[PDB]
Design a protein around this ligand. Structure first.
Ligand code: XP4
Ligand code: XP4
Ligand code: LMU
Ligand code: LMU
Ligand code: HT1
Length: 393
């Protein structure tokens, strides 16, 4: 909190923008599958969400490059303009009595795209206006702001999603505006280069030390991808109802976000002068242990505790990995590096989903072995990467 007021103006805007972004995500985007399922098929909803994910990954790659090629600010400003167009069109597509789902999909496809521009470039900018001393503070403040805001979003969302959709859309447009003005007027450019998209990425992919870290990061973000692919299947398939797996899985998310909001500062106090190599390993250890405990148990009391363990790990892990990457990052090609960092979520997700296809054969005990084993791999790759980088001092 006190740290926030002593930061660079640009970084403060970054926190503001992500706050608003996450809030609006919570309220509207969390419940968009409900919307799509209602108006379109579940075959359609699945195809739609697949396209949006591919769309946003491509947004991230383009934003990463253009953040390096031109400045960070133009890209960010472009993103907000895209968002305005999407938000306005989504408002006009959801008029009561004249609700157009397909139009709303396209509008939301725009908003997601526009948002990842502001995110991808914003990440590059975080590195630009940060020094090695305050970098971790920024990353955690970022991470904290998002969690608190997704909760506030979720609360308002539940109350008004079904009754007053348009109200949220109006609010979404208004948050986009706030963010747009901020990005245009208040924000100052942080990077001046001294290009070819393939050549821009070829260099980052040729960075073996970063690529190793990327592989480690994919394995630790693979554990997070559990909520997306194997925690629901587990609970829906075999959760003992207490006077409802999908309802329990929902609790877990709420619990975790609440725990981050509350224990951020506290757990940070204990980890204040830890190495990033350490934080990654302790975080990625508790995260794997928490998931394994959840997978092997089907009762409320153990799962709830198991969830507490995972969140302990996630809180430490998140800022530590985010700083480690920045240190391994080339100062001239930060944008391209953040672009490459987009691949961690789809790959970690695809593998977790692919793993879930074989879930019935191997079962919970079998699944956990694969998690533990891949987490051990993450530890190996982080040490390899940190070691190689340490030389470059
Ligand atoms: C202005 C309002 C904008 C509202 C948010 C739109 C988000 C659209 C998400 C749908 C497409 C998608 O796959 O998003 C990818 C993006 C991943 O980026 P990152 O989390 O790797 O930085 O996802 C994210 O950036 C994460 C989503 C928000 C997380 C909230 C807290 C956890
Ligand atoms: C309803 C089932 C789905 C049908 C297939 C839609 C998929 C195609 C992609 C989108 C094409 C535009 C359709 C549309 O209405 O969306 C945009 C928006 C909303 O119109 P409204 O909500 O004000 O009636 O209006 C605008 O922004 C553009 C309006 C001006 C030009 C006419 C274009 C068609 C408008 C819809 C038809 C007229 C309704 C009275
Ligand atoms: C209270 C807190 C509630 C939620 C807290 C945090 C949620 C964090 C991020 C959610 O992020 C996500 O939401 C979408 C909404 O369906 C996913 O989109 C969806 O389609 C993807 C395509 O196969 C699937 O792999 C995802 O599991 C699925 O959820 C997005 O790709 C992802 O970007
Ligand atoms: C004032 C204090 C308030 C404290 C908590 C308030 C919570 C208010 C609403 C919480 C809603 C939590 O859960 C509700 O949104 C979640 C966010 O995507 C959904 O979670 C859904 O999207 C997630 C994102 O990838 C997926 O991993 C889940 O598998 C999917 O089910 C839940 O399925 C939905 O039921
Ligand atoms: C063909 C292309 O296929 C693709 C497939 C998937 C994705 C994809 N992109 C994603 C981005 C984010 C997430 C995601 N899922 C999460 C589940 C939980 C959490 N939280 C964060 C908050 N803490 C407190 C609890 C855990 C974060 C999460 N982030 C999943 C995602 N899946 C992209 C392309």
């Amino acid at each position: 909190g006190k740290e926030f007021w002593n930061l660079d103006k640009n970084l403060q805007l970054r926190l503001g923008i992500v706050f608003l972004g996450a809030f609006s995500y919570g309220t509207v985007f969390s419940s968009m599958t409900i919307y799509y399922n209602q108006y379109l098929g579940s075959a359609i909803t699945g195809i739609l969400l697949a396209l949006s994910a591919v769309a946003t990954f491509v947004a991230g790659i383009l934003a990463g490059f253009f953040a390096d090629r031109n400045g960070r600010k133009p890209v960010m400003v472009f993103g907000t303009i895209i968002q305005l167009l999407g938000a306005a069109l989504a408002i006009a597509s959801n008029l009561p009595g004249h609700v157009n789902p397909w139009s709303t999909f396209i509008a939301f496809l725009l908003i997601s795209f526009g948002y990842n521009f502001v995110i991808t470039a914003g990440n590059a900018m975080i590195i630009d206006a940060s020094n090695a001393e305050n970098r971790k503070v920024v990353f955690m403040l970022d991470y904290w702001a998002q969690n608190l805001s997704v909760i506030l979003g979720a609360a308002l969302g539940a109350w008004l999603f079904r009754p007053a959709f348009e109200a949220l859309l109006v609010i979404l447009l208004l948050t986009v505006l706030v963010s747009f003005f901020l990005t245009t007027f208040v924000m100052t450019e942080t990077f001046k280069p001294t290009d070819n998209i393939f050549q821009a990425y070829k260099t980052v992919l040729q960075d073996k030390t970063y690529m190793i870290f990327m592989g480690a990061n994919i394995a630790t973000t693979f554990i997070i991808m559990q909520f997306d692919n194997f925690l629901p299947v587990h609970l829906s398939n075999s959760f003992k109802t207490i006077t409802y797996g999908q309802r329990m899985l929902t609790i877990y998310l709420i619990l975790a976000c609440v725990l981050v909001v509350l224990l951020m500062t506290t757990l940070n106090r204990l980890t204040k002068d830890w190495s990033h190599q350490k934080g990654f390993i302790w975080g990625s250890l508790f995260m794997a242990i928490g998931m394994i405990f959840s997978f092997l148990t089907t009762t409320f009391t153990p799962i709830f505790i198991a969830g507490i363990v995972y969140t302990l790990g996630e809180i430490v892990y998140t800022p530590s990995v985010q700083t480690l990457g920045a240190d391994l990052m080339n100062p001239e090609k930060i944008g391209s590096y953040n672009g490459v960092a987009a691949i961690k979520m789809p790959i970690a997700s695809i593998l977790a989903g692919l793993l879930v296809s074989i879930s019935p054969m191997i079962k919970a005990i079998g699944v956990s072995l694969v998690l533990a084993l891949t987490e051990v791999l993450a530890i190996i790759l982080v040490l390899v990467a940190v070691n190689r980088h340490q030389k470059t001092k």
